[PDB]
């Protein structure tokens, strides 16, 4: 570009409109351990 | 009120503002911490005058000193020694930690609270910098071999070679041949 | 950027790092600590960081900026507002360039293609 | 390490609250350009973009962008210059990217502690320490080296 | 050789503004008295810092003031689960050892920082770029090998990952570019010539009426008679628009033993 | 020089680094390189230790 | 939730109030989704300017000195002064014994010699500390001016003008942006999209593989 | 994983002494010249540099400072503005940056 | 009784009259409260710290007199005064020297009072909030020259940028819309005029200089 | 990282009861 | 079913897995795949819980 | 397979895993515990697991396999030999198919190529 080269592969603009339906996933701070006494 | 905050800036030019509030002539000779010494030192001076109250009943002065201790403990916190530290909220200015700005580890300890990862480890860069050994004085009266040997040692001039890391003393590493007697825990 | 009033908390918690902060909803209880009379619509209290902004204005109108704005109910609103927009700016950036760090993202623990299983 | 320790001490806290006009932690640019954006103006949307870029600059607390090393437009000294030249946010975001790419490490996320602790180095604290040890030494003498009875 | 004063000193013109946040009569009366004698009072403490003298922060009665920490739901239980809610109380209750421990950084923000590479590794990078722009890339092999050898491996990993991040951010910025420069159906064939000579103020409340009935005095002269007539006209238009309705789709989250889709929630329960 | 050349194992957490599966979905297919088995680590001049 | 003030401004919360019903209130949030993608892209087209303008290169060998900050230990000098004063009180409190009892003659004779040596150490350290502080203050001020006069020319480069012209075009561009309607749809900023696209098309080439090209002195955040 | 684990790339010899663990020697360690010898050796270089290496220095210093800039276009600007219209390749050969 | 207690009396003279004469005997609770806070000679008003010094001062001084009262090592060398054979004459001035060194017991107490503490590692921990640091923190440091010289450099260069910034805004104000949209623009950009609107040219929104 | 950390893929409702934490 | 669908974060150590830098030097250049974002985890029949 | 008498102890230690075992040299002290007379050449004692084998043969020749071989000096040689060849077979396979696990391998922590740095 401005006296600088940044090697990158061929960009695919089609990846912009990629259908990614969001999925449910909850994190539980406070849960179960592996073993209990 | 927002316009009242900028009153000293409207009368000034940009160059006058910089020379006024930004380019303050360096003068590191003042005792800035006198403000804290006077305030906190007044507790001791106040105790001198307060311990002489002409109150007749001994248990009435017990109440006075209980109230005076409450005034102090609002700042000191823990009454027992070697237990904790006091808590004083101070003003933020450009001279906070002015004499330790050159040290990098002091900034990381004060400023950065790092988030532990799944691979629960200190950053490798932080560990690597931590292995670069610091400088430890040879003078040692705690190890009796050096207490005797260093009396016959000849202090020769260490001519500067142009560096800032000349190991003219021993190194603060447990594996150094002149520091293995020191316990690093 | 959040384009709604409500957001799932888990979507702003980390999946492969310890969770030391949350992105909580606006603290509506602080609105009842203002002693003076004011008009606030319920349609503006859920959007992120805006309630603390309107409160700061209400407090800067009733009081000023000198010796009267310096009361606990008004300074906490100014501190919350300033802190809310800083945290939300960082979380928004982290969501834009580091979406793999958060729960719910399919890249935090990528599910492999069937061609990678060798069947 | 093992060094001298005091019985009672005080820890200072240079808090960067941002709500106190008495000290340098007051963000004058943010509060002025924010109130400026509340009034109807032709640049009302421009000032908003400016404030958003200013927040993206605080978010970059790198060695080249921080108050500890007294960098321009990041320290308390140069907080007023934002009032005259708010266009330099892009220059900062680019400068930090130049040095980070060549001479820096990975951009890691950390929590920036605004509370700045510092142990106050006082004189009277050691007087109290000597007094406590003076009582301890006197008991050693009172119990074992007292021959008055 | 006068001491330097900060900008805050010119707002108040004194070093002894007795600012106390506790709004009790005993406190504000004592502050006004103390604020007047601060010039000749030995029990005076500064609250405006200077080059020659440090200062104290805001006072809370006899103690010191600090804002309530920003609400953080993260907590750690000791004896029993407390279900701490930072939004249930105005001021955060103190942390008892046997009850709860709060998250670190009562007053902390989220920032991004970077480690500073070793000085000798930096000098090898400077020498490579310098030899690159002077002698070209093909004649910088010796300077490249010095980098791989002198720079510790933890630094090479950072350098390796910086390229992958900026490659990621480069795409994330170009995807936004594509979505931003996309021409929608409502702007097909429109150019700068079809733009109106309007500014931001022309879309405000004074020039553009909001979508509310009581924003101005537009509907203040409406009577119940005019309303009943208007209800008849809107119902007339519905005799032609109600003919169509979207069909009910299948529930993708019908099975409870299946990871549900984070589908948009309904406006109302 | 020995402590300059004293590293720790495993480096940093890989899961905190950019994923290859994510770059593919962003439009950049990463290229796979081989290990550089020919370079020997050495300490710099004494002035930098 | 980034771009807070920008989004709050586009929704009109600076002059009006949102609808009290969720249906329309939520549509108004999704209407600015295009404008945020635009205003963020515009902010990433700023041209570069010399980094050596308001910041000295920290990698320069001149800064390999790793110099420390010389200070004055007032608290140390004050304690040792109060401790020396304590000895004078001990002699005064016990003056008759030190002066008249010959068994304490050695203290009467040598107490002042030790006190002077203690004072010498106290004042020597304070005096030396003071000298080093002044040598440090006068060097940073002299060396700072030499570096200014050395790099003043960097302000004459045309890239400084190019940087300011880009900043003004964004100001005039965003000043022309306006809300066209209140239907709570993306078409409420229909004409503003064309204005911003012209700005982006003026500093980039949309018909490229990567219209936004990376350079180390560019914008990422 | 043991916490006190280190990977070393140079040979070390550990002493087999009771109650102590440390590095007692480095294989093939050569003792270079003493600090006094290097001092005398350096003074001879500084003495010559002080007597014969001070003419035409002001120009070389400007060239060195110009090459410490970030971008090449700024170097050319520094050379033309400060170094009296110098050339990039011609100045790099003087400083010894050319192959 | 001491002068400081007498000073309190003259200051509390009117207060004593109100408590001891009026409140201390009125009736009921006002009596119990006034008789509890009575003013007079302090019951158990002795100060043990004062006494602790007086005792330790006297005991240590009796030791100084013994340690300092020794026969001279110099006079025993001639074998003419009081000392012919003194095989431990070289121990005569050990205890005296040991007592004279005690004058620096409190002057040099702790590490900070024996050296320049800012050059020692424990000082860094105190300034870091009494926090543990790696032992090599004193070496990993950025030059203080850069931090202070760059702080001045940045400001001296901004005053010159403010003047350059004004000349640029002025020269651009006299520029046509076509010139300010094509100069410094991308080559592939085709200029298309926009509708003229009123947008002021204000240097600083805040009324600053 | 917290030892008692779990990622669940199906919705769950937790009881808002004192001294107890359960689904 | 909830505990069947209750996983822990980060999986196992990637450093204990075959490297791509090693396969290259062994003669096999791995192909980079993208993340499968369309699959929804579900529990099996009750008999297998 | 090891094609020498000596091996670097570090070359068989794990880099990214806890080191709970070493691959030590043959225990020559066990050879002096045999009370009977035997002929052993020093040229066979360093190779892995062979010394324990020869000692086992000497003990199986002097004594048998019943009520006379069951003495501590002879059973430890049989156990050491059976255990040495089992570990060496496992370490040899782990060295063949998992060379990246051990110290000294360039794939344990791959050094990147210069093209991956972006300079
Ligand atoms: C001719 C005869 C005389 C006729 C004249 C009579 C009239 C005299 C009065 C007028 C002239 C006074 C001269 C000085 C000007 C002061 C003006 C003023 O307004 O001061 C108010 C003064 C300061 O007001 P403030 O801002 O609220 O600060 C106090 C706060 O507590 C502070 O709270 P804080 O948390 O912010 O700070 C904590 C504080 C620490 O503060 C404390 O710890 C005290 C806390 C209170 C005790 C705790 C229990 C709570 C009690 C509450 C109830 C108290 C009710 C009292 C009501 C009194 C009403 C006035 O520590 C500090 O901040 C720094 C203090 C140390 C700085 C250095 C001090 C230098 C003093 C120099 C002394 C010089 C005189 C010699 C002294 C005597 C020598 C033998 O308040 C006081 O009344 C202080 C009382 C202290 C007792 C003084 C006893 C000695 C008096 C000597 C008189 C003259 C000599 C007498 C000789 C005897 C024969 C005559
Ligand atoms: C079965 C029943 C029995 C069970 C009993 C219970 C078991 C114990 C439970 C323990 C509970 C936990 C303890 C607390 C946890 C926190 C511990 C901690 O953090 O300590 C760290 C702290 C760190 O020091 P370090 O690690 O040991 O040493 C490192 C440094 O050297 C230290 O700093 P440095 O290097 O800067 O210091 C240099 C040195 C410099 O010294 C020198 O250069 C030369 C020495 C000069 C001495 C001058 C004394 C000062 C006044 C002299 C004035 C008169 C002049 C006379 C003539 C002088 C001739 C030259 O200065 C000194 O340290 C002087 C020490 C003087 C001590 C007195 C000398 C005799 C030795 C003590 C004998 C009595 C204790 C034994 C009790 C036995 C009972 C069975 O420990 C201490 O040294 C402080 C000791 C006290 C700690 C306990 C405090 C507990 C809190 C409640 C009590 C508060 C006191 C109230 C007393 C009231 C009496 C009525
Ligand atoms: C809960 C914990 C609280 C902790 C914090 C509070 C700690 C409180 C402890 C206080 C203990 C010290 C007392 C401080 C003063 C408070 C008032 C007081 O003394 O108690 C009531 C006291 C009555 O004693 P009492 O205990 O109630 O009972 C009497 C006994 O039955 C029989 O009467 P007596 O006369 O036979 O007994 C004498 C009595 C009282 O004797 C006294 O008069 C106390 C005198 C204290 C020294 C004052 C001068 C210090 C130097 C000032 C330098 C000024 C610098 C600035 C210069 C201007 C330029 C900026 O006891 C003492 O002497 C205590 C002395 C304790 C040792 C002090 C020296 C130790 C040095 C070891 C190294 C430590 C370094 C830190 C030292 C810091 C010093 C600043 O009041 C008076 O004695 C009135 C005296 C009136 C005439 C005095 C005229 C002035 C004399 C000045 C000294 C002249 C000698 C040469 C000095 C040369 C200086 C260059
Ligand atoms: C210009 C200004 C205007 C001036 C004009 C006005 C003039 C008026 C003057 C008025 C009064 C002036 C006072 C002096 C006149 C006294 C005349 C008299 O009749 O008095 C008799 C008087 C009567 O006895 P007293 O009244 O019953 O008690 C007297 C004392 O209280 C206690 O008496 P004591 O006898 O018990 O004290 C004994 C003590 C007295 O204290 C001292 O004088 C310190 C002595 C240190 C020097 C020792 C020399 C050892 C011989 C080495 C030979 C080579 C020398 C080479 C030197 C090169 C230097 C780089 O010496 C010792 O401790 C003896 C043991 C020596 C250590 C044991 C081991 C020795 C062998 C070590 C060999 C190591 C070699 C290793 C490697 C070798 C490889 C080749 O006795 C005296 O001698 C009075 C001395 C008073 C102290 C004076 C010094 C005060 C400190 C001043 C600061 C230091 C400046 C001087 C430094 C000198 C060089 C270090
Ligand atoms: C000279 O020969 C020698 C002796 O003489 C024989 C000795 O006795 C001794 C033994 C020494 C001792 C027994 C003394 C030991 C003392 C020790 C260990 C420390 C004592 C510490 C205390 C008593 C606690 C003091 C606490 C403080 C000072 C903190 C709070 C501050 C206070 C109380 C003062 C306020 C500070 C100021 C600067 C203001 C000063 C105020 C005044 C001067 C007012 C005075 C008022 C009057 C009425 C006189 C030695 C070693 C010796 O060498
Ligand atoms: C009779 C005198 C006896 C004194 C004791 C004998 C021993 C004397 C030992 C002398 C050692 C001198 C070495 C130098 C020590 C340096 C002290 C110091 O740095 O103080 C600085 C600093 C000056 O402030 P700056 O302007 O910021 O600094 C400018 C620097 N030029 O001084 C201070 O800290 C102020 C406090 C001074 C000491 C305490 C003052 C109060 C004294 C208490 C007794 C007085 C009681 C009566 C007071 C009247 C109150 C109404």
Automatic annotation (TrEMBL), chain A:
Domain of life: Eukaryota
Coiled coil region boundaries: none
Protein name: Ymf66
Residues included from the entire protein: 14 to 50 of 446
Automatic annotation (TrEMBL), chain B:
Domain of life from the UniProt record: Eukaryota
Protein name, UniProt field: Uncharacterized protein
Residues of the full protein shown: 63 to 247 of 247
Automatic annotation (TrEMBL), chains C, L:
Paired cysteines (S-S): 49-84
Name this protein carries in UniProt: Uncharacterized protein
Species in which this protein is naturally found: Tetrahymena thermophila (strain SB210)
Residues shown, of full length: 61 to 179 of 179
TrEMBL record, chain G:
UniProt organism field: Tetrahymena thermophila (strain SB210)
Domain of life assignment: Eukaryota
Protein name stated in the entry: Uncharacterized protein
């Amino acid at each position: 570009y401005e006296d600088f080269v940044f090697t990158t592969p061929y960009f695919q603009p089609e990846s912009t409109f990629k259908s990614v339906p969001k999925l449910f996933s909850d994190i539980l701070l406070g849960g179960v351990e592996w073993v209990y006494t | 009120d927002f316009a009242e905050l900028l009153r000293p800036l409207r009368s000034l030019s940009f160059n006058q503002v910089v020379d006024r509030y930004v380019l303050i002539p360096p003068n590191h000779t003042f005792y800035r911490n006198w403000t804290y010494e006077k305030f906190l030192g007044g507790f001791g001076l106040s105790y001198l005058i307060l311990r002489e109250l002409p109150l007749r009943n001994f248990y009435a002065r017990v109440f006075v000193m209980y109230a005076f201790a409450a005034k102090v403990l609002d700042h000191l916190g823990n009454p027992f020694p070697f237990s904790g530290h006091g808590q004083i909220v101070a003003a933020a200015d450009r001279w906070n930690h002015w004499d330790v700005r050159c040290y990098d580890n002091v900034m990381k300890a004060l400023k950065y609270i790092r988030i532990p990862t799944v691979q629960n480890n200190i950053p490798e860069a932080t560990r690597w910098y931590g292995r670069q050994p610091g400088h430890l004085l040879r003078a040692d009266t705690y190890w009796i071999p050096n207490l005797v040997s260093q009396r016959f040692a000849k202090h020769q001039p260490a001519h500067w070679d142009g560096t800032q890391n000349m190991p003219i003393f021993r190194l603060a590493d447990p594996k150094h041949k002149d520091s293995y007697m020191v316990q690093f825990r | 950027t959040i384009f709604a009033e409500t957001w799932e908390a888990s979507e702003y918690q980390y999946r492969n790092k310890a969770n030391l902060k949350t992105l909580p909803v606006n603290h509506l209880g602080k609105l009842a600590e203002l002693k003076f009379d004011f008009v606030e619509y319920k349609a503006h209290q859920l959007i992120a960081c805006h309630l603390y902004e309107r409160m700061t204005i209400h407090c800067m109108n009733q009081y000023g900026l000198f010796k009267d704005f310096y009361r606990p109910e008004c300074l906490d609103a100014q501190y919350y507002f300033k802190t809310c927009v800083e945290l939300n700016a960082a979380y928004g950036i982290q969501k834009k360039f580091f979406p793999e760090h958060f729960v719910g993202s399919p890249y935090a623990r990528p599910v492999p293609q069937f061609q990678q299983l060798g069947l | 390490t093992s060094e001298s320790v005091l019985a009672y001490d005080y820890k200072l806290w240079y808090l960067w609250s941002g709500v106190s006009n008495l000290d340098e932690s007051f963000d004058m640019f943010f509060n002025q350009y924010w109130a400026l954006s509340l009034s109807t103006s032709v640049f009302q949307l421009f000032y908003a973009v400016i404030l958003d870029r200013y927040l993206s600059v605080l978010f970059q607390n790198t060695p080249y962008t921080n108050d500890w090393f007294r960098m321009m437009l990041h320290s308390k000294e140069t907080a007023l210059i934002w009032l005259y030249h708010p266009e330099l946010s892009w220059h900062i975001n680019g400068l930090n990217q130049f040095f980070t790419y060549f001479y820096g490490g990975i951009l890691e996320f950390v929590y920036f502690d605004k509370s700045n602790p510092d142990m106050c180095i006082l004189v009277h604290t050691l007087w109290i320490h000597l007094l406590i040890l003076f009582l301890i030494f006197t008991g050693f003498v009172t119990i074992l080296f007292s021959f008055y009875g | 050789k006068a001491p330097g004063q900060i900008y805050a000193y010119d707002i108040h013109n004194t070093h002894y503004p007795y600012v106390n946040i506790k709004q009790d009569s005993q406190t504000q009366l004592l502050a006004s008295f103390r604020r007047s004698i601060a010039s000749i009072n030995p029990f005076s403490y500064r609250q405006v810092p200077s080059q020659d003298r440090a200062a104290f922060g805001l006072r809370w009665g006899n103690a010191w003031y600090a804002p309530n920490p920003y609400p953080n739901g993260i907590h750690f239980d000791r004896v029993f689960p407390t279900h701490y809610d930072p939004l249930a109380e105005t001021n955060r209750t103190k942390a008892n050892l046997q009850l709860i421990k709060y998250a670190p950084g009562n007053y902390s923000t989220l920032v991004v920082t970077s480690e500073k590479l070793p000085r000798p590794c930096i000098r090898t990078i400077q020498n490579y770029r310098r030899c690159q722009m002077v002698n070209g890339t093909e004649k910088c092999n010796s300077e490249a090998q010095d980098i791989l050898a002198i720079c510790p491996n933890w630094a090479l990993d950072h350098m390796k990952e910086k390229v992958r991040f900026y490659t990621k951010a480069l795409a994330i910025n170009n995807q936004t570019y594509i979505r931003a420069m996309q021409v929608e159906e409502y702007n097909q064939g429109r150019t700068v010539a079809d733009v109106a000579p309007k500014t931001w103020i022309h879309g405000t409340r004074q020039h553009l009426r909001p979508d509310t009935m009581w924003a101005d005095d537009r509907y203040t002269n409406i009577t119940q008679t005019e309303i009943n007539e208007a209800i008849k006209r809107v119902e007339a238009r519905k005799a032609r628009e109600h003919e169509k309705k979207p069909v009910e789709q299948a529930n993708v989250n019908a099975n409870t033993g299946e990871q549900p889709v984070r589908v948009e929630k309904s406006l109302y329960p | 020089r020995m402590r300059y050349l004293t590293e720790d194992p495993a480096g940093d957490d890989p899961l905190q680094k950019t994923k290859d599966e994510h770059l593919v979905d962003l439009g950049f297919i990463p290229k796979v390189f081989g290990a550089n088995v020919e370079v020997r680590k050495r300490a710099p001049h004494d002035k930098y230790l | 939730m980034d771009n807070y003030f920008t989004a709050i401004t586009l929704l009109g919360l600076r002059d009006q109030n949102l609808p009290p019903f969720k249906d329309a209130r939520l549509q108004r949030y999704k209407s600015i989704k295009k404008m945020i993608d635009l205003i963020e892209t515009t902010t990433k087209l700023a041209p570069p300017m010399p980094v050596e303008l308001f910041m000295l290169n920290p990698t320069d060998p001149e800064w390999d000195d790793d110099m420390t900050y010389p200070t004055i230990t007032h608290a140390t000098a004050l304690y040792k002064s109060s401790a020396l004063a304590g000895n004078l009180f001990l002699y005064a409190y016990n003056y008759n014994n030190f002066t008249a009892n010959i068994r304490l003659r050695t203290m009467r004779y040598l107490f002042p010699v030790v006190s002077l040596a203690i004072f010498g150490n106290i004042y020597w350290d304070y005096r030396s500390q003071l000298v080093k502080v002044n040598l440090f203050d006068e060097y940073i001020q002299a060396r700072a001016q030499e570096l200014v006069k050395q790099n003043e020319y960097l302000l004459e480069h045309e890239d400084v003008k190019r940087y300011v012209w880009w900043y003004e075009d964004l100001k005039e561009t965003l000043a022309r942006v306006h809300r066209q309607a209140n239907n709570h749809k993306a078409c409420d900023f229909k004409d503003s999209e064309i204005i911003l696209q012209d700005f982006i098309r003026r500093y980039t080439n949309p018909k490229d593989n990567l219209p936004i090209k990376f350079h180390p002195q560019g914008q990422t955040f | 994983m043991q916490n006190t684990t280190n990977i070393v790339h140079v040979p070390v010899h550990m002493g087999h002494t009771h109650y102590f663990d440390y590095i007692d020697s480095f294989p093939k360690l050569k003792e270079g010249p003493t600090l006094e010898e290097n001092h005398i050796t350096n003074q001879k270089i500084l003495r010559e540099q002080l007597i014969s290496g001070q003419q035409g220095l002001e120009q070389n210093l400007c060239l060195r400072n110009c090459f410490k800039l970030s971008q090449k276009r700024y170097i050319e600007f520094c050379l033309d503005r400060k170094c009296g219209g110098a050339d990039f390749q011609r100045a790099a050969t003087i400083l010894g940056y050319t192959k | 009784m001491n002068p400081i207690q007498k000073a309190w009396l003259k200051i509390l003279e009117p207060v004593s009259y109100v408590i001891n004469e009026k409140m201390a005997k009125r009736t009921g609770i006002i009596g119990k409260l006034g008789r509890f806070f009575a003013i007079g000679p302090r019951e158990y008003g002795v100060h043990p710290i004062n006494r602790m010094f007086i005792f330790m001062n006297r005991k240590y001084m009796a030791f100084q007199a013994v340690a300092l009262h020794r026969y001279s090592f110099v006079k025993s060398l001639t074998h003419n005064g009081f000392h012919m054979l003194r095989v431990f004459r070289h121990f005569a001035f050990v205890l005296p020297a040991t007592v004279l060194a005690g004058l620096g017991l409190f002057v040099y107490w702790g590490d900070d009072n024996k050296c320049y503490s800012p050059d020692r590692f424990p000082y860094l921990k105190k300034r870091a909030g009494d926090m543990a640091l790696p032992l090599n923190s004193l070496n990993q440091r950025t030059s203080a020259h850069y931090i202070e010289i760059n702080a001045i450099y940045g400001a001296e260069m901004m005053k010159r940028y403010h003047k350059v910034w004004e000349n640029i805004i002025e020269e651009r104000s006299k520029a046509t819309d076509q010139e300010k949209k094509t100069r410094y623009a991308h080559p592939s950009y085709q200029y298309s005029p926009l509708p003229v609107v009123s947008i002021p040219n204000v240097l600083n929104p805040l009324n600053l200089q």
